[PDB]
Structures are given as C-alpha cells and as structure tokens.
C-alpha cells in the first residue's frame, strides 16, 4: 500500500452506427476526408451551378471566352457597391474611361440558382483582395456599409452581401454581418 | 439514455433509411459507406432541414461530386434530424480531430454567434442532448434551439 | 475503395413513335426544321 493509487478512467465506446452488424461508416477513411469549409456550404453555389451560371450569361451576352472574363470584374465591382438582389429588370453598369456601358441584369438573375448571393459568393475571396486595393490610395466603404452606419475603417474589407462567413474570419467582422443580415 | 429516445430513430426506421438510400443510388454494400461519410460532413456544416429538392456534395480531391438529396430526406422517418443523430458520437469525434490542425467551427455556430472554441465539438444541429453532456454546451442548444 | 463512387445517370431512351418497325419522323431534318 506504499503506492498512491491512480484512478482508471473509464472508456467511452463511442456508439458506431451500424445497420445489420456490419459498420455504417469507414472510418479508416473518414480520418483521411478532409474538405473545406467552404466548399461544402450552402452559401456558396456547387460548381455545377456556377458553371451553368456562366456559360448562360456568356451566350446572353455573345461575347466571347476571350472578353468574357472582363465583364465578370465588372459585375463584382457592381456587386459590391450595389448589393447581390436588384430588380430582375434593369441594368448594371461598369465603365471604361468615363462612357458607362450598361448589361441587361435578366439573364443573370435568371440562371443563378438558387440566387444571386450565392453564385457572387465565388468571388468573396477576391472582392475583399480587391476592397484591400482600392483603400490603399483613399477612403473607401462599399455601400451596404454607408448604408448600415459602418466607419470602422477597417471593417470595410469585410462589409457587402455576398461576403462567406467562413471559419477564417477575423471575428471583429462576423458580428457585423449577423447584426445587419 | 439514448436508446429509447426519440431524437434517435429506432433502429428499424435507420435500417430502412439505410437500405432505401443504398438502393436509390445504387452504389453498393462496399462503397456506401464512403457515402455516408460525406453525408455526415455536408450535415454536419448546412444542417439537416434542407430542400427535398437539390443536391449535397461530397469531394474526391477538388471535383464536387453530387448526390439527390429527395431519397434522404423522403425516407427518414420521421425526419432527418433524427436519422443523422446516429453519427452524434462519432460527430463530435470528428469535429474534435478536425479542429486539431487548424481552428473549425461548424456553420451552426457561425451563424449562431459561437466562438468558444471548445463548444464547436457540440455544434450542430443533429447533437442528441443526452445525459453525459458537458452542461457548458447543453445550454447552447436549448437557447440556440 | 479509395475512389468515392459516382451515381450513374440512367438514360431515358425516349420512345420515338413508330409504325411497323421503322420511324416516323427523320429527327435528321426535325432538329433542323425551325420555323416562326
């Protein structure tokens, strides 16, 4: 009795579903499986969606492989300022020089399924690389800030509506969406 | 505690859910498991209310495969929350391995305002709230549900 | 079993009309045929 004694702890056998004795599950693989956050969620469309979304809008326009990828920067830059759920009719704009060209918005509205929000997501990730850009020379807020009272300067990177909160966000931010949202 | 709950479907109804998901994809007793193993993971991140209509996704490398989600959902009697409670344990079990590597939260908390850390383990929707819960996370799901 | 399994699409053969074993219609021209 000269030894302290140490309690045994107890083992938990986690319950694995089964159906007919055998496993439901293999875990030898569920250890290795490993997606991201992102593209499993909702808020983003599959990339069959989006595919679709853009082979649609590229035959609506008639533009071309080539061209088409410049018109995409300017949806997103409209995105921003705008927001993700215009009238299905209408116009968005984007410019060279000063001449504002204008695109129909139907055929965009239209092909996004399940909407707009979620094939714009795709781009969350470069329209804050691209916020980030644009302060750098001067003070800038997209809209659906100016809109909810946000100066925070620094909140600006983060702030319009089709921003994924996924699980790398500074939390200083994710408070913003949720509380406006 | 769990066994004759009703947030858990009886062995039967997950039998059936089972064998009648196997058949609509038909893919086979040796490969369905793999399945199952994205169904967990798509749930565990989107929840498991969704349409009747659409698809969930599972990835081999980067190539998003999709699967209906009308066979799942229309089999699971009564609902899917309770079929997919079958995998709490080994839920949490792989949310605590998960976050491991790098910090992971399940989207059931970050549309709930969660940043714990230590309850994303317990972080969605289909946790069955059984008797050995640590009470730091048994509140969350009662205020959250 | 490394290799995540695909759903195989079934395909709907749809049930062109014929009459005594050939076709009716000459879908060579139908797909052509577009009209006001």
Same mark, same amino acid.
């Given at each position: 009795?000269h030894?302290?004694?140490? @309690?045994?702890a107890?083992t ?6 089964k159906?007919?004795?055998?496993? +439901? ?8 499986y490993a997606?991201?956050? @992102?593209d499993?969620?909702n808020?983003?469309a599959?990339?069959?969606? *989006? ?7 590229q035959?609506a326009?008639? @533009?071309?492989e080539?061209?088409?990828?410049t018109?995409?920067?300017?949806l ?10 215009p009238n ?8 060279d020089?000063?001449?504002?060209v204008?695109?129909p918005?139907?055929?965009?509205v239209?092909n996004?399924?399940?909407?707009l929000?979620?094939?714009m997501?795709? *781009?969350?990730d +470069?329209?804050e690389?691209?916020?980030e ?6 003070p ?7 809109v909810?009272?946000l ?8 702030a *319009?509506? *089709? ?7 500074? +939390?200083?931010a994710?408070?913003?969406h949720?509380?406006m949202?």
């Amino acid at each position: 009795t000269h030894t302290v004694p140490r @309690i045994k702890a107890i083992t938990s056998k986690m319950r694995m579903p089964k159906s007919k004795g055998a496993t +439901v599950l293999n875990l030898e693989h569920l250890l290795e499986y490993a997606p991201q956050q @992102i593209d499993i969620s909702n808020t983003r469309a599959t990339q069959s969606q *989006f595919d679709t979304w853009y082979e649609a809008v590229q035959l609506a326009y008639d @533009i071309g492989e080539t061209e088409m990828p410049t018109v995409m920067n300017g949806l997103m830059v409209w995105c921003i300022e705008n927001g993700t759920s215009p009238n299905i009719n209408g116009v968005w704009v984007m410019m060279d020089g000063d001449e504002q060209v204008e695109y129909p918005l139907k055929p965009i509205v239209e092909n996004a399924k399940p909407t707009l929000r979620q094939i714009m997501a795709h *781009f969350s990730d +470069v329209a804050e690389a691209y916020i980030e850009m644009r302060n750098k020379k001067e003070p800038y807020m997209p809209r659906y800030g100016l809109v909810r009272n946000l100066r925070d300067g620094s909140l600006a990177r983060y702030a *319009f509506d *089709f921003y994924e909160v996924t699980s790398r966000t500074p +939390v200083r931010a994710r408070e913003a969406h949720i509380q406006m949202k």
